[PDB]
Structures are given as C-alpha cells and as structure tokens.
Ligand binder design. Structure first.
Ligand SMILES: CC(=O)N[C@]1(C(N)=O)O[C@H](CO)[C@@H](O)[C@H](O)[C@H]1O
Ligand SMILES: CC(=O)N[C@]1(C(N)=O)O[C@H](CO)[C@@H](O)[C@H](O)[C@H]1O
Ligand SMILES: *Cc1c(COP(=O)(O)O)cnc(C)c1O
Ligand SMILES: *Cc1c(COP(=O)(O)O)cnc(C)c1O
Lengths: 830, 830
C-alpha cells in the first residue's frame, strides 16, 4: 500500500477490538447510531492508547537520568490535526488503514473530521509546532509551554467577497489528545503593590488567577520518545473571587469569575503586528509566571532535591535549564526569573543576573517596526509593579556597561535604553531580551545579518558573541510523508526510508535527474495530487477548475509586505493581454490566493475583496475560457496547507527584499515538487543557493536596491508614467472596471499604491511579469520542468527542522541530539 | 462482610485489571505518582464501565417496545456522590471492596474524595433525586431533565461564627459519570417580537442560545435498568455571537459569548423563596424549551415515525408522553407546548389545549406566599413575547369557563385570574399550572387538604377531579443500605433482603420488638454509628464531643418557619437550669444544628450567628462539663446527611403547624433509628399515624390552634409576661450575655420575636420544653428507648419513594410499575 508501516496480523486484530471497546465504553454508542464523528473518536482514542505507554516511560526516563531540560516558551503553537501525524510517527498508518477498512470504514473520511488545533496565526506558530516534532525526534528533554486558548485563530468566511470572522470553537466536541492535570494548578499574581521591608521587597495585595495545565503528547519519529506540550488555562480562585465581602451580590460574584478566566479565552489574531492591549500583556505574564514555577520545581527535585552539594545552589541552574524565548512575547520571563531568584530565593542581584542570562536565549522573527513590542510604562506600572522596578534596575546596570564601553557616546545611550522616552514612556521588550540572554538569533542568514547591520547594530558592537543565526526549517514528517505519501513512496523506492529523519539524503536523488522512469513518476504523483485537489475543490467549495493548467498559488497571511497586490497586478495583466489577442496561445493557469486578514487590518481586508473582484470578472469572461482562473482559497490553515502545497506547480514568495524574516511556506513548496518564483528575501536566498540559481525564478530588487531607492526617494508615479500596461491596470481599478456597482470601491488601494506604498510594489512589477513569462515558457516543456523540480526536491534537505534544532541544541542549548530509540514501549507497571 | 453482594473470584480479578487499565490508559499515571484522587478515578471509571452495557440496552429497549415516556422536569436535582450508590444498585460493593483491598487501598477512603453533585437547595432537589432512583427501580421509561449548573449550592464556611459563601466548583477535576452529547445540541430563542401574518403568528428577530445535553446514567436497584438524567448546558452560537457586524471589536465579541453561557452558570441558592430576576426566568425557559424539542423529536419517531394512522396526529401524544412539573419552575412548558403545537405544527387552539392539559401534571411544594412565583409582565413581555400572548389567551378562555360556572361571581373572577393587577401586573405561575394540567398534587395529606381548603379553594370548586395527594418518600437504598449498612444487615439477618425494594416488609420487624438479641443489636449499630460520627467530627472539624450523650440534631436549610430559633430557646433553657442547680443530674445531650442560609436572607444568617454564639458560652462553661454541647454542623449537604442521620438519637421537626409542606429529612431519621420530637405538620402526621402517637413525641399547636390564634391576634408579650424562664432568656439576649463585645448584636432577633414573629415561636415554647423532658426521661431507659425505635423503623415502610412513585405512575401518569429484571447486561454488539 506504501511504507506507512506494516499491517501485521496480530496488530490489526488488536486494533479492531480496541476500536470497538472505545465505541462502546468510551463513546457509549452502538454501531446502529454511531456517526462518522463517533468513528473518528473511537479511532483517535485507540491510537492515543498506543502512546501513553511511551509517554509515561519517556517522562520517567528524564526523571531518572536527569538531563538538561529545554523549555520552549511561545504564545503560539499552530498544531493542526494530530491523528495522522501520530499514526505516522508510530508506524501505525497501514495497520489502522487495514483495520478500519475491515471494520468497513474509510480512514481518510474519518481523518477529515478532526478539528485543527489552530493556536497560532501563521509562521511563528507553525515553527513552534515543527520544532516540537523535531526536538522529540532528536531525543531532547524538551517541553513546549504555552496557553490553551479555547478559541484559536478565527475561521474565515467570504461573504459577498468580504472576509467574515467567526469564532473557532475547536473544543466544542472535545479534545481526545489532551490530559487535564488539575492537580498541578499554580497561582499567578496581578496588580498589587511593592513593599520594601528590612530584608527585601515584597509583592503585595495582588489579585490571584490560577493556572491549570493540560498536557498533550508529542511523539518523536519512530524512536519511542513522547515529549510533552503543556498548555495553561486560566481559572478563578473560589475564595476572593467570591470572598472579598461587603455587598455586590452572590450571583454576580460567581458570574464575575469569567473575568479572570478571560485570560486564556482567545488568541490575538495578529500576524506581524503589535497591539498594546492589557489582555494581551496579561496573557504574556500568565504563561511566563506559571511556566517558571514549573521549571524551578522540577529543578528543585532533579538530583539536588536529594543531595549534590546540598544547599539550593542555583549555580547549576543553567546547567540543567534552558529556556528559549520565541520572539519577545514571553520576554517577561527575564524579569520574572530575577524576581523569584532575588525576592523569594534571596540570591544577590549579580548572582541572580548571571544565572538568568546564562539560561535565557532569544529568537527574533521580524524587523518591521509595527511588529515590535513596546509596552507603555503605565501599563506595566499598574499590572506588574515589581517587574517594572526590576526592568529599570536592569536598564540602569546595562547602560552603565555601555557608558563604560563607549565613553561620551551619549546618543548611543538613549538608543540602547530599554526605556523609550516620548509621548508616553515605553519599554522596548526586544532590548530587554538581548540584555538578559546569552544568545540572540535571526531566522535566516540575511535576516540575521540585517539585525547586526541595522536594528541591533549597537548591541552587536557591545557583545558580538551573543548574535547568531539559525535558519528556519520544517518537519519532513508532516510536510512530506503525511501530506504527500505518493512522492515519499517513489523517493523511498529509490533511496530508502532513512531520509525521513535525515533529509540531507535527498541529495542522492540528483543521480536520477536523467532517469526516465523517475521523471515520469515525479510527474505522475504531482498530476495525481492536482487531480485530488481539483476534486476537493468541487467537493467542499464548488465551481470547477482545470487540472491541466499551471497551478499558481500564493498562500500565507494577507499583508502589504507579502505583496499579494503585486500578484494581483500580474493576474490582471495576463487577463488584459488575453483580451487584446484572444486567439493567441498562452499557458493555462489557475492562480490560487489564500490567507487570513487580521480583523482590524483594513488594507488587508481590502485586498481580499480585490482578489475576489478580479475573479468575478476573469472567471466569467467567455473569451478567456479555461485559460485563466482566479480562485481565493477560503480559510487557509494547516490542514488546508497539507492539501494545496502538494498540488502546487508554482510557489509565490514575492515579499519586498528585506521584509520577510525567513518564511517557511516557501520550504514546504520546495520539498513537494513546486518551482519557486521569488525575491532574494529571507530563506529564498538560501534555497536558491542550495538548488542553484538556474533552478530558481528570482527577480526584483535586492536589499541594496531597496535602500538605494529609499535614499533617492520612492516615487510610484514614475513607474506609472513609463509602463502603459501598469497604467492601464491602475485606471481600470480607478474607474470601476472591477467594481461596477461601487466604482470608487478600490480608491484606498490605488491611493496607497500611488502615494504611500511602503513596499514599492510598482518597482518590481516589470521584472516580475518578465520573470513570470520565463516560467510559462518552461512549463511548456514538461520534461525540463520536472527535471528542474527534481533539482529542487533533491536539494531541499538543509531545510528540515531537524537541522535547525540540531543547531540550536549544539550552539545555544549545549545539548547533544540523539537518534537513539528509547527502550520500546513495553507494558511495565512498577 | 455484609450483604453488599458477592466477592466472586473471577470478578474481583476482573475488577483489579480494569482498575489498572484505567490508571494507566485513562488517567495516564503510574503507581509511583498516583494519589488517592487518582485511585478514586480509576475505580469510578471501572465501575462506570459496568453500567454502560446496561445503559445502552435499556435505551435501545424503550426504543423497540416504545412505552409511554415519563419526563420529570425540575430545575433541581440534588444527586450527591454517585460511586457507592452505583456499586450498591449493581451489587458491586463487596467485590470492589475486596479488589481495592487486594490492590492495597481503602475503598472508604477513596469514596470520601468524590465531590457532591449539589445541583439542589434542599428538599425539593433531593426529592427529584430519590424519585429518579425509584422510577428506575420500578422499571419506568423515565427521564430526569434539568440544567447542568457549573456551580451548585455554595459551600458554607463559618468565619467568626458567621456563614461565608464560596463557589462550589464541583467540576474542577472532572465528572466521570456524565457523557457530553454535543451532537444533540438544540437552539433556544429569547427576546425578538411577534409577527402576525396571513396564516399564523411568527416569533421573530430572536437571540439564539444553544443547549448542549449531558447524560448521566440512573441505575435501578439490581434490575439491570439504567435510565437517563439529561442536563442542559448553555453555549453561544459561533455566528451572530460574532457575526452581527459593524464595529465593536473582534476580541470583545468573543469575550461576550460568556453572556449567553451565563444561563447555566450557577444555581439560585434560594429555598422556599421567590426572587424575580431575569437570569432565573432565562434558566426556566432554557430547560423547558430544549427539553420539549427533545420530547417531540422522540415522539415523532416512536412508531408514528414509521406508520400508525400516518399523519402527525398529536392525538396520541398524551398516550405516549407525560411531563411532570416539579413546582412552578418549569411552568413555561405549558405555554411553550401550545406555541409549538399551534405555531409550528399548526393545530387548532382547542385540539392543542386538549393535548397539553392531558400530558401535563403539576406538583405543589409550598403554601408560603414569599415562595410563590409571580413574574412581572414587563419581563415576560420583553423576554418571551409570544408566550405572554398565549398566557393571556389561556387566561381569557379559562375565566370564561369560570364565569359560566359561577355566574355573577365577579370577585371569584379576579381571584382566579392568571394575571394579577396592582403595583405591577404579574403572572401567577401557579394558577397557570393548575389550568393547563390534568392533575395537581400536594406532597403530604395535610398539605394537600390545605391546598383545597385554602390557597386553591376556588380552583378545587371548579375542577375537584384535578386535585390529589402524593405523600413524599425517600429511597431506602441511599438512605438506609448505603448510609447505614450496619442496621440494614441486622434487619436482613432476620427478615431477608426483599425489603430493600419493598420497604413495607419492615413491618415484620414488629415481631422482634421483644427479642432480646435484636434489641441489643439495634442498640449496638446505633452506638457504633455515633462513635464513627464522633470520630469524623474530630478528624475533619476538630474539638471533641461525648458519644454517650443523647444526639439531638436538627439539620435542614435555615428558615424562620423551620424554627431553629425555637430549638435555640430550649438549649439556652437547659443551660440556665444547669447553672441554677449544678449538682443535679440531667441526661447529657449533644445538640447539633446544621444547615445553609440563603446569602440574601439576613435573619437566617443572624440565626446561624446565634447558634454559634450559644455554643461559645455553653461549650466553655466548666460547671456544664460534658453534660451539654452545642455544635453547628458545617456545610450540611447530602454526603454530610448520610453521616449524621444514622448517628442521630433525636430528630427535630418543629416547624409551625401548617408551614412545612411535607419534609423528607424527618423520614430519613425515622428509618435510621432516631426518635422524633415534632409538631403535627407535613408528613409528621402520617409518620405518627403509622407508628402510633405513643411512639412519637408530638407537641405544640395544631393547624386549627394556629388559626384560632390568628383570629384572636398573636401577642408575644403575653408569653413573655407569663413565663419567667422565657423572660430570662430574652433578657440574656438583649443584654449581651451571648455577645459581650457586641451587646446589641441580637437586637433584630429579639425585636422580631417580640413584635413580628410570623411563626409564633413563643406559643409552642412551653409545650416544647415539657415534651423535651419526656424524651430525656425515656432516654434514661435504654431498653424502652430502643423498643420504641424498633416501633418507628418497623413502621416507616410507607415512606419509601417507591410507594410515592408507584402512586404517581398509576394515579397520574397511567403507567404500571414493574419489578422485572431487564434481560441481563450481557455484551452484545449489533
Ligand atoms: C513576528 C513573526 O511572527 N514573524 C514570522 C512570521 N510572521 O511568521 O516568523 C516566521 C517564523 O520564524 C518567519 O518565517 C517569517 O518570515 C516571520 O515574518
Ligand atoms: C418549594 C419547596 O422547595 N418546598 C419543599 C422544600 N423546601 O424542600 O419541598 C420538599 C419536597 O417536596 C418538601 O418536603 C418541603 O416541606 C417543602 O417545603
Ligand atoms: C507554513 C504556514 C504559514 C507560514 O507561511 P509563510 O509562507 O512562511 O508566510 C502560515 N500558515 C500556515 C497554515 C502554514 O502552514
Ligand atoms: C433530605 C434533605 C433535605 C430536606 O430536609 P427537610 O428536613 O425535609 O427540610 C435538605 N438537605 C439535604 C442535604 C437533605 O438530604
């Protein structure tokens, strides 16, 4: 059937009965009233059964051996469905497929019932998930720590061409994977005031919110290691949240509990944008405060909570602990670690600071100013008083270091301050992270360099040793084996299976680049994938597409810097050229654009309306026929990504040079047989470098060109004046060609494009369409197109998260990865 | 060990492994980190496993045979713990005891970990629970329908002698018994307006709240029947509760979902008191609207949803359905049934009305005015517009019936109206129920008569056939076998086990009233029970009592009509007499008073402070020694009731004649070997009548005396003037003898007692203490005390809920009870 494992005789029989046990005892249903949803749960529970054994021994193991623990703090974890992924890492896919088949059910039909765990906005959240999968696969004692939002990223609905947001109640039917651990609930404080008494400061009169943990298992790839992702849930104490007496109402008091519990109610739907709301800050301290207590407790036990030097010496803390800050969201971990160490454990400042800097590491994910976290001091002042004091004290000592290093450089001082003066004083979270961490890293080579050259230049000059780079990656398991079994099979037919956990081995495929059979096969799976997607489209969304055309797709969150607008310009151009010479042949294309706009991002929502507007015109023009279709992929999410990517021919990664930190979608397309048309931005540079620029469609300004233009000054009118085709499009938008009933509907877009385009869309127009012509040319030559594809696929190995994690492990955490199978799952009950 | 069943070889082995399976796979724990709480859950799950098989066949059975269904609508279901009760009804107690013993665990210690299901205030809620247990035992196709509050009755805390309320988060650790059934979620409407168009009225522009059901199994006693208790939970739709666009905030919109979900958040903590809050009304329509849809759906399938006459003829509705209204709380079921029938199903008014009256029955639980539900019309007007219209129309036709029966009786007309004029117009829910039901019943013989003679006299004269009586009962299982295995064993040793489901058989114990061995045994178990309680007291609450003294206890909700105050007067009197003649012998007593005061009931809370105040004095007076202790039982609840009742010698049921509808606590004491000192009120009358007044301690005014006094006019001063002892007590309270630091602390009580005592406490003082002297006399004669006890126990059979339910079944529902064992639980998987 494929290498989804063995369909053993004994195990298929075993599976079936357990499937039945659960249907009866767990779901309390009988075959005569069970629905697909019930069948999905019976299975889920049956599968979950298989990793509890391993989950328990893995955790017990780490307790015995006591290795250095890695803690990945992130406000986001974009998990997606977990049934299939679990079967894959446990080599259970074929057995389950067989068993369910014998039970008379279609496993695939059941997998579609699982709701996505959308606790993330996009790239940052998905990285965290791939990282988790990689850390388990590499046998690291790592824990993902976050918030268990009851409402993840909103489900996108297109009404009249406009995006409509609706609550994502992903827990509505229950989450068979998580394990509530009410017994480990911890208290978290808010507000209050600071008392300075005799021997130390005291955080007093605080409001208490409880943090209840929920554990979700993270299985490594076929190595019997199952790590833990601990998500926190806000709960109100039953005392003060009722006991603070003297009139108000008993009923009202109970109803008001949903005020402390609002903290973990919903994820903020912003991608690369900073919103300074109190709720957000509260979420940020909540996950930090709870997690740290859990970390220190585990440490207090270790082998110190037995003997060792005997005396809670936190000198060995950094030797046992390592916490990674995914962006600045969990930045309060730094001052909070100091608070505990200094205030509660009573360590002297300097010893506390040494420990903190040695255990903390920060990862930066963007350079755009609007995405930088700058919290108003009055907020910190009211909500976390003692933390503010600590930050000022950190700032004080840091600046003293600077002054000592650069005597007289008074401007440098203000520039590096963690405190920003002006309208309202703010705290530059990024500056905080750099100062209190031993390592800071970019997510792509160019991005990392930009940090040292620009944004954090002064910090680099002060401590060059802190700055590193760790190019992002993705997991081959979910992003290849899971979503593209067909491609994985033919690859395995030639080079084996060892590449699943050693993606570099894909290079061996280079020697098949001229293999007639292979070329045919690679080409075949992609054709099958396109057919399956084309079907899914009519199945769930309804209104036909042509599987023979080139599948042109751009899927990622809607942003001005992502330039979906530039994509739009090309599409309209194609249309206009066809309308000019109808009977001229052109390579058929189905351009698919998908992604979510943050609810408050007016421009982004305007762009979605534009895309749909273009399709209304293009898709109903008889002269165009089936040569050009414009489709807006609805509710783009992980599960949807696993369907389109494998079916894509052309991958669009066209951000303005210098704006996309790295990107990971791009990597997903490269590994699944799609060619890339893009700019020398983020990881695109390393991809083309890895596959050779001849096998990549690069175009547009490089970072330097962008800057040159900015010195000069960017004037869009010039491009409007010199390019007729471009002019024609702008005037079409301005006159209502795409919005008859509302002729001025797109004035904001046009206005912006002409007068305040921060991302100079026009500057890359000419080179972009020219380049698009080159890909159409190559598509006309199937054999050569496929051969270039083989060149990309065979060379994408470097982009596996296993590599990224291996690097974090060695160069930052100080731990050695291991592909050693944990001692089987075997029963055991001590 | 006892007759808790057989500890079979095969089953104990089977239990153990399943206990282990759950500890591992379900709890995901290993013996080395498992806590008593974990062990409790492993067991619970193991036990729950045993009744799913039966639950499924029972439900499937009713589907095949299709008998008349009984629907018990109640806003309250005071369940308590369910582990033990389940083991008992499944004959699993000894086996579990053995198995857990072999696993090295104390089953009793684990049972104490289960949280109480306190979804009730007191008697009304507990009746519903006993009824459920009886209906299952009698093999009726009955369903308990209610609301799944996430917060039940508040946990009571005594701070400085004052009651402190704190949220009862009973679901904090999960509820292993319930089964979420998200697939059966139903919509419920609120607000909107009524449109009258061509062919009928339309309820329009309504706000939708979803109702998610949760099923809890209700096992009959050893007959393999497991019925269902369906509790509804409020959920917000993800559309409009987000989709009603045009600014407000996406985050805020998601946070505001906890506004529709507040409906099932907390139980109103009022016992015998009406609070007209909107939230309450919303809870009332919520449970009604959802339940009815579920009832009609089931009906539409029946055997009509196949063939029969073919044409949804609701003429057979009352032959298949019967809904019981537990008090007026679910009263909206009447107008809602009409709404559906007339508005949606399109039946003519008269046919709809005939059907409704034929399927609805109402049970009245009180005569005090402040407990009567009178909803302001403006409320109904805004929240349920169409229902108000229906009510007016019902009222219109009803009054026309009255006018026709009593021509010219204009006063009668206003008196019977469902609509009450005055300050604000109200709707008399009780009047509604009577009019739209074919049967109305009291909960005790005297109570029922009072209804016909007083409160509902006019209604009785109009339709005498509607009024009946159904004396309350209690379940012998939880209230004897479960809480008092010792007593149950010795009884069984003589007369067998058949009395557990046939309590009348207890009469056979009469012939052992002179049996020397029995007398010794009855006396022995009560001594053991008192010792166990005396221990529990020091264990969990701490501060000694004497097990040789008479256990004088009054436990029930705190009320002015319950007269805990009268109890107080006696206690103080005893104290004063002792302080007068210290070296005179008096029978030692431990008087225990316990119960919860509704948070807004100032007087009731004042009384709790008085009780504790008395104990502060009495318990620390050296001259008193161990002859008199005053103890306030904290957080009285079902689980606590199962501990005190079996340990009680004297049961206090001293309400003012005519105020306690029936009472059930009294019955609980009678069956567990306690003698009763009480007034001829509620079921007390039938108890003494059943055991013979010679074996009862009756005292005080009868109903007639009360009325005589009211004609005359009640003047407390007279009693104050003629009884020195009474005077002495009042002046002690007035001067701060019981409240040194705050001498005027009890002015409200004294003032009330002297000028506005609605329950004439003073009028029964003299006869009460005189009577108390008689019980002390008899206690001095162990052999005779025990013999009188045997007379009560042997004669309590009539008070089993099996009898009550059998009567409802035959005289109201039109169904025949059956003690037929359902065809085993045996595997089966069709
Ligand atoms: C701030 C933020 O979330 N940044 C982003 C992204 N929005 O996904 O993180 C991911 C993961 O590192 C990178 O691939 C993107 O280029 C970067 O912009
Ligand atoms: C209105 C109400 O709840 N009434 C009560 C009670 N409060 O428990 O119901 C129970 C059960 O019928 C009766 O035993 C009490 O005498 C009656 O007062
Ligand atoms: C990988 C992924 C992303 C990130 O995409 P980029 O192209 O790097 O912006 C966002 N959303 C989902 C659903 C993803 O799988
Ligand atoms: C039986 C019971 C009641 C009712 O008591 P009465 O004495 O009839 O007022 C109230 N609460 C609990 C906990 C009960 O078990």
């Amino acid at each position: 059937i494929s290498v989804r494992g063995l369909a053993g005789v004994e195990n298929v029989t075993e599976l079936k009965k357990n499937f039945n046990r659960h249907l009866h005892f767990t779901l309390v249903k009988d075959r005569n009233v069970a629905t697909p949803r019930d069948y999905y749960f019976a299975l889920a529970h049956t599968v979950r059964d298989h990793l509890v054994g391993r989950w328990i021994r893995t955790q017990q193991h780490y307790y015995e051996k006591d290795p250095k623990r890695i803690y990945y703090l992130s406000l986001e974890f974009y998990m997606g469905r977990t049934l299939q992924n679990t079967m894959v890492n446990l080599a259970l896919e074929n057995a389950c497929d067989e068993a369910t088949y014998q039970l008379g059910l279609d496993m695939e039909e059941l997998e579609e019932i699982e709701e996505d765990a959308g606790l993330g906005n996009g790239g940052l959240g998905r990285l965290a998930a791939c990282f988790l999968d990689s850390m388990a696969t590499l046998g690291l004692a790592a824990y993902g720590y976050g918030i268990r939002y009851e409402f993840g990223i909103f489900n996108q609905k297109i009404c009249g061409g406009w995006q409509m947001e609706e609550a994502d109640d992903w827990l509505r039917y229950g989450n068979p994977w998580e394990k509530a651990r009410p017994e480990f609930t911890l208290p978290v404080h808010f507000y209050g005031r600071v008392e300075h008494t005799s021997q130390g400061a005291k955080w007093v009169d605080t409001q208490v919110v409880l943090a209840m943990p929920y554990d979700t298992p993270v299985p490594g790839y076929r190595n019997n290691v199952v790590n833990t992702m601990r998500l926190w849930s806000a709960k109100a104490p039953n005392d003060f949240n009722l006991k603070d007496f003297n009139v108000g109402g008993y009923i009202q008091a109970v109803l008001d509990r949903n005020l402390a519990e609002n903290i973990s109610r919903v994820l903020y739907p912003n991608d690369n944008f900073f919103e300074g709301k109190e709720l957000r800050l509260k979420q940020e301290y909540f996950v930090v405060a709870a997690t740290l207590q859990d970390i220190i407790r585990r440490f207090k036990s270790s082998k110190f909570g037995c003997r060792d030097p005997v005396r809670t010496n936190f000198d060995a803390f950094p030797d046992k602990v390592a916490i990674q800050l995914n962006d600045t969201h969990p930045s309060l971990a730094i001052p909070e670690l100091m608070r505990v160490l200094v205030d509660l454990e009573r360590l002297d400042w300097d010893k506390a600071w040494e420990v903190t800097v040695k255990t903390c590491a920060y990862t930066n994910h963007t350079v755009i100013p609007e995405a930088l976290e700058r919290w108003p001091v009055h907020l910190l002042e009211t909500l976390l008083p003692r933390h503010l004091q600590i930050i000022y004290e950190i700032n004080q000592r840091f600046l003293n270091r600077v002054a000592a290093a650069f005597p007289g450089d008074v401007d440098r001082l203000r520039r590096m301050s963690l405190v920003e003066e002006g309208a309202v004083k703010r705290i530059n979270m990024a500056h905080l992270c750099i100062a209190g961490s031993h390592a800071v890293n970019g997510v792509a080579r160019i991005h990392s360099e930009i940090l040292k050259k620009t944004i954090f230049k002064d910090f680099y000059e002060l401590e060059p040793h802190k700055f590193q780079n760790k190019t992002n990656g993705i997991t081959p398991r979910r992003w290849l084996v899971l979503c593209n079994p067909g491609l994985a099979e033919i690859i395995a037919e030639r080079i084996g299976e060892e590449y699943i956990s050693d993606l570099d081995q894909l290079r061996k495929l280079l020697s098949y680049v001229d293999d007639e059979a292979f070329i045919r096969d690679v080409a075949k799976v992609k054709q099958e994938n396109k057919l399956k997607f084309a079907a899914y489209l009519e199945r769930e969304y309804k209104v036909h597409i042509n599987p023979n055309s080139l599948f042109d797709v751009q899927v990622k969150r809607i942003h001005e810097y992502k330039r979906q607008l530039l994509n739009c310009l090309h599409v309209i151009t194609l249309y206009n050229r066809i309308k000019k010479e109808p009977n001229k042949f052109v390579v058929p294309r189905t351009v698919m654009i998908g992604g979510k706009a943050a609810p408050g991002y007016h421009m982004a929502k305007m762009i979605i309306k534009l895309i749909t507007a273009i399709g209304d015109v293009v898709n109903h023009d008889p002269v165009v026929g089936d040569r050009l279709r414009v489709i807006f992929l609805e509710n783009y999410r992980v599960s949807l990504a696993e369907k389109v990517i494998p079916a894509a021919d052309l991958s669009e990664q066209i951000s303005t040079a210098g704006t996309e930190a790295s990107g990971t979608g791009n990597m997903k397309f490269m590994l699944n047989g799609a060619l890339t048309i893009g700019t020398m931005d983020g990881a695109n540079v390393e991809m083309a470098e890895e596959a050779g620029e001849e096998n990549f469609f690069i175009f547009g300004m490089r970072v330097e060109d962008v800057d040159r233009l900015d010195q000069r000054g960017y004037n869009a009118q010039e491009y409007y004046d010199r390019i007729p085709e471009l002019r024609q499009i702008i005037e079409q938008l301005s006159s209502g060609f795409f919005s008859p009933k509302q002729p001025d509907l797109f004035k904001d877009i046009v206005n912006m494009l002409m007068h305040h385009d921060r991302f100079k869309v026009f500057a890359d127009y000419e080179e972009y369409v020219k380049c698009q012509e080159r890909v159409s040319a190559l598509y006309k030559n199937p054999r050569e197109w496929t051969r270039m594809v083989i060149r990309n696929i065979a060379t994408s190995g470097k982009f596996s998260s296993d590599r990224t994690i291996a690097q974090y492990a060695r160069e930052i955490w100080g731990v050695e990865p291991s592909r050693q199978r944990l001692p089987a799952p075997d029963e055991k009950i001590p």
